[PDB]
Amino acid sequence: FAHLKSATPAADSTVAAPADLRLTFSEGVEATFTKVSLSKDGTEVAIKGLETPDADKKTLVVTPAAPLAAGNYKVVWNAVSVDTFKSNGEYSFKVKK
Numbered sequence: 166f167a168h169l170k171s172a173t174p175a176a177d178s179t180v181a182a183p184a185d186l187r188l189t190f191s192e193g194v195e196a197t198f199t200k201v202s203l204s205k206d207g208t209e210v211a212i213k214g215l216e217t218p219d220a221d222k223k224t225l226v227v228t229p230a231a232p233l234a235a236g237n238y239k240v241v242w243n244a245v246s247v248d249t250f251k252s253n254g255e256y257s258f259k260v261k262k
Contacts (some may be wrong), residue, residue: 166192166210166244166248166250166251166252167190167192167193167194167200167246167252168190168191168192168249168252168254169188169189169190169191169242169244169254169256170186170189170190171188172186172188172189172240172248172256172258172259173186173187174186174260175258176185176256176257176258177253177256177257177258178258178259179258179259179260179261180260180261181196181257181261182233182234182260183233183260184228184232184236185216185225185226185229185230186201186203186227186230186240186262187224187225187226187227188201188224188225188227188242189223189224189225190223190224190225190244190246191223192223192246192247192248192250193217193221193222193223193246193247194222194225194244194245194246194247194248195213195215195217195222195226195234195245195247195249196215196216196217196222197244198245199215199225199229199242199243199244200242200243201215201225201240201241201242201243202240202242203227203229203238203239203240203241204238204239204241205233205234205235205236205237205238206236210229210230210231210233211226211229211230211231212227212229212230213228213229213230213243214228215227215228216228222241222247223253224246227240232248233243233260234260235260235261235262236259237257237259238257238258238260239256239257240256240258241253241254241255242254242255246258251261
């Protein structure tokens, strides 16, 4: 099943605001059924949508509905793999001004 292998912004990083988050999994994931929750400083922020731009479907692109301001972010993910195995996890990062 899909485990998170890396992300941009990276886990525990402090970065300038990114236009999207990119999560790389150990297996392909289904963008239609995967779900991601993003929160800033303990409150959910809206997500516009999810994309897997590659044929192998290992990288998931998460676009917020509005630009990411500085703050402390938590990403909660619920992946459905291309073999229909569900997994879940989380990680955090910071956006600096």
